[PDB]
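> example.struct
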């Protein structure tokens, strides 16, 4: 055994030892219990970043842990390969997105291997390969013929200078983020998944997910946004009917979740596109301008609640069907056409958004709910105004004194009796639009024929292959300019036809890849029935919180779609979910020509603990604030430099020790140095133990007759094993597991293990510590284990707790005062000559 720890000598040998043994190449062996540990697969962007290393180390700790406990562990990896990065890189470097992607994949694969992740590389997938995406084209066609996928005109943001469609996030004050040109709202046909048909199942099945973080479940509930409320029709006043046709001349229909407060409605509000808005605006330029500004808006959903709410009165009136109040119709920017009826009622006393709106425009506020003896203040919002549970009705006529549920039913009865309303259930969830006007994506398997319509491509003809011999130029989607791709014949009639040129939302590939890993080379379906039956669901999913809503909802949706197609048996893809925190790092700047700030990467910096300077010249730079690593402020630390400098095990240890997985991880040079030094300590501890005697049979069995000091070390040992096991398998906090092993080694350092029984206990401590740490730092632990013991580490398995090592000594002594029934003198007095060990006599 070499004296000094050298990661570059031992880490490749260890990786070849694991590959040669094929520990990670698993199959559907019905003998061991399966365990499917999955980390969210990466975009092949070019290189790993520190987020990648954190995620996949966390996955590897859990996978190796379960492996050591006798599970048949599948830990697969692959490439979410489609999307915009390759297209932009194609425009920058004038290369093909496919070629750029396959080079990135090959480089990033090497980096993953070098980190020693116990990954089943025989299950690798690359979603840009036809052998992958053909199966989502297949599923598309089946759902399309069922109407679960459908085509319909939608509205997009067109940038006329960049010639591409932009999301609301990419529109800044009505203009494209890169071009700066005013975007144009354009209606175009697009494809949609009818995800709303699965809304109730997607909502209710969250209750099955006892091992999901409650905040992720809450986020999905709010996103789905089910509500049980009331349709209410307010008759249009006789004086307000000019310009209206059909039912819009007869009544204004709204949806409310608070029909218990219908007595306190003080006005109503409609969307800009509402017919009442159009009729009122017909002769009022201020309304036409307000309608125009509403339509031109591009507010993102994550910002919808943070926008300034504005309205204009229309001079039109409707009648409350329960009290006869004549209420004015306002046009408001927060009422969305297409949500419900595009028209709401307002109760400023009991809805906070209505309270702020009314307060802005000095509109009436009518209290109709009371909660205890709390005073109602029409000029200040108190949180109890909106309480649904503990309130009773007031100022509501014959409805007074009722609670929410009884008021709901009474209003429902009153409205239904006179035909003015009925209970209704709504969802905020919109259908899923999957059409992208981009090249580097999965082709949509639709052929357009003027005789036959939009025709799904037959299963025989799938895939529709995306040509990879393309370099996008940034003047429109290349597929639309490629007659060699889109000119085809109709598969129903054989006539002249055109392929769809839009490609799929790349969320589609990540919505089912966890099933494809089960049988990645299966050529007769999305996933083979034998392999889906064996692996079932993912037992553990690990990934960033930014995917807590869309990706997970899409994946749960696809799983239920595939179940209903008979491809899988589960209702839910992910049993346990762990969400890792961000990786943050200090930023460094040095001002330049125009009173601004230029940003320097941390690896090109050296500190003086005073100030910092550039490593190349030694000239100062300004130390700035800490934030998530990104190209924005040039503060991303390349993990490849971390590996080159210290080795994979140090990288893995620093990530797991620095913070709990959910907590943000702060980059720290001293922290990285401390991780490496601990590995040197571990190395020297085993080396020094073997230098004074070599290996012995580890202590096992009855520990009677062991000295107090060695019994104490065995106690620390098996409590540490218990602590670590509970940290890996239950708390999923690996930092405290590392600290616990560090405490074991501390006590070992203070224990004389020189005797024959001492060496036996020392062997037992070390054999346990290297296995307890092997999930985190497998290369050095594999090497150290081979110096201590000849068995296969993974066949020795996870350390067992010896309960007997946790029972402490006992000795019953009789208490007697005057003859009748330091250490023991204090205990017996808690109930004086002492006979050692048997009796204590209290001279009374
Ligand atoms: C399943 C599909 C939809 C996944 C999709 N292909 C994807 O997100 N791919 S990915 O390649 O972007 O990320 C793959 C994983 O690992 C990384 C995690 C990052 C968490 C955020 N972060 C970043 C940083 C700074 C890093 C250093 C910068 O110099 N700090 N925190 C992801 O959340 C995800 O778990
Ligand atoms: Mg259950
Ligand atoms: Zn045809």
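> example.seq
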């Amino acid at each position: 055994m070499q004296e000094h720890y050298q990661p570059a000598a031992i880490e490749p040998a260890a990786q070849k030892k694991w590959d040669d043994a094929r520990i990670s190449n698993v199959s559907e062996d019905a003998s061991k219990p399966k365990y499917y540990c999955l980390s969210m697969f990466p975009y092949p962007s070019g290189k790993l970043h520190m987020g990648h290393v954190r995620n996949y180390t966390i996955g590897d700790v859990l996978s190796r842990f379960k492996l050591l406990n006798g599970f048949n562990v599948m830990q697969p990896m692959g490439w979410d390969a489609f999307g915009m990065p390759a297209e932009n890189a194609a425009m920058k470097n004038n290369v093909a997105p496919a070629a750029w992607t396959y080079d990135n994949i090959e480089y990033m694969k090497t980096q993953l291997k070098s980190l020693g992740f116990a990954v089943d590389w025989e299950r690798e997938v690359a979603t840009c390969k036809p052998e992958y995406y053909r199966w989502e084209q297949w599923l598309f066609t089946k759902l399309f013929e069922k109407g679960i996928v459908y085509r319909k005109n939608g509205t997009v943001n067109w940038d006329p200078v960049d010639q591409t469609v932009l999301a609301n996030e990419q529109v800044i004050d009505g203009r494209g983020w890169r071009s700066g040109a005013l975007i144009e709202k354009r209606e175009i046909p697009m494809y949609y998944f009818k995800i709303t048909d699965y809304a109730e199942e997607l909502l209710n099945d969250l209750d099955k997910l006892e091992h999901w973080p409650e905040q992720v479940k809450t986020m999905q509930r709010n996103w789905i946004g089910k509500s049980r409320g009331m349709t209410v029709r307010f008759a249009v006043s006789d004086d307000s009917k000019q310009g209206l046709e059909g039912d819009y001349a007869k009544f204004l229909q709204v949806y409310t979740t608070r029909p218990d407060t219908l007595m306190g409605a003080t006005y109503v509000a409609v969307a800009a596109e509402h017919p009442l808005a159009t009729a009122a605006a017909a002769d009022k330029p201020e309304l036409q301008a307000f309608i125009a500004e509403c339509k031109a808006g591009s507010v993102a959903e994550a910002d919808m609640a943070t926008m300034e709410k504005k309205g204009v009165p229309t001079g039109r009136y409707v009648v409350n069907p329960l009290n006869g109040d004549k209420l004015e119709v306002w046009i408001a920017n927060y009422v969305l056409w297409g949500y419900g009826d595009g028209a709401v009622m307002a109760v400023p006393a009991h809805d906070e958004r209505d309270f702020e709106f009314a307060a802005k425009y000095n509109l009436p506020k009518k209290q109709v709910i009371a909660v205890g003896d709390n005073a109602f203040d029409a000029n200040r919002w108190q949180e109890w105004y909106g309480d649904k549970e503990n309130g009773v009705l007031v100022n509501s006529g014959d409805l007074d004194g009722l609670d929410f549920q009884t008021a709901f039913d009474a209003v429902a009865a009153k409205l239904q009796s006179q035909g003015a309303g009925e209970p209704k259930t709504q969802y905020r969830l919109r259908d899923w639009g999957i059409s992208r006007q981009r090249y580097w994506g999965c082709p949509i398997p639709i052929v357009h024929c003027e005789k036959c319509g939009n025709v799904p491509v037959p299963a025989d003809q799938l895939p529709v292959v995306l040509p990879e011999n393309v370099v996008p130029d940034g003047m429109g989607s290349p597929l639309a300019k490629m007659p060699e791709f889109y000119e085809t014949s109709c598969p129903c009639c054989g006539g002249a036809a055109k392929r769809e040129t839009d490609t799929m939302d790349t969320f589609i590939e990540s919505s089912w890849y966890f099933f494809r890993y089960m049988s990645p080379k299966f050529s007769d379906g999305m996933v083979s029935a034998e392999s889906a039956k064996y692996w079932g669901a993912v037992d553990q999913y690990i990934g960033g919180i930014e995917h807590a809503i869309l990706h997970l909802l899409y994946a749960r949706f696809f799983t239920k779609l595939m179940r209903d197609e008979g491809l899988v048996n589960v209702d839910e893809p992910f049993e346990r979910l762990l969400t890792q925190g961000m990786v943050v790092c200090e930023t460094y700047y040095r001002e330049n020509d125009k009173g601004g700030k230029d940003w320097i990467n941390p690896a090109d910096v050296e500190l003086t603990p005073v100030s910092a300077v550039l490593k190349a010249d030694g000239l100062p730079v300004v130390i700035s604030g800490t934030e998530k690593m990104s190209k924005s402020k040039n503060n991303g630390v390349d993990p490849q430099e971390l590996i080159n400098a210290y080795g994979a095990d140090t990288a893995r240890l620093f990530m797991m020790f620095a913070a709990p997985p959910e907590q943000s991880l702060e980059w720290s040079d001293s922290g990285v140095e401390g991780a490496h030094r601990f590995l040197r300590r571990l190395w020297r501890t085993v080396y020094e133990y073997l230098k004074q005697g070599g290996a012995v049979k580890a202590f096992a069995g009855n520990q009677d007759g062991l000295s107090k000091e060695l019994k104490d070390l065995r106690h620390k040992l098996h409590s540490t094993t218990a602590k670590v096991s509970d940290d890996y398998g239950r708390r999923q906090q690996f930092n405290t597991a590392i600290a616990a092993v560090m405490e074991l080694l501390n006590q070992y350092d203070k224990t004389d293990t020189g005797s024959e029984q001492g060496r036996a206990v020392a062997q037992e401590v070390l054999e346990a510590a290297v296995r307890l740490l092997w999930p985190i730092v497998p290369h050095i632990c594999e090497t150290l284990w081979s110096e201590l013991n000849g068995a296969k580490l993974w066949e020795a398995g996870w350390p067992t707790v010896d309960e007997a090592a946790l029972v402490k000594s006992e000795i019953e002594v009789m208490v007697q005062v005057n003859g009748k029934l330091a250490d023991l003198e204090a205990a017996a007095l808690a109930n004086i000559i002492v006979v050692p060990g048997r009796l204590v006599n209290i001279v009374v």
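> remarks
Residues 449, 451-452, 490, 492-493, 495 surround zinc ion (ligand 3) (CB under 6 Å).
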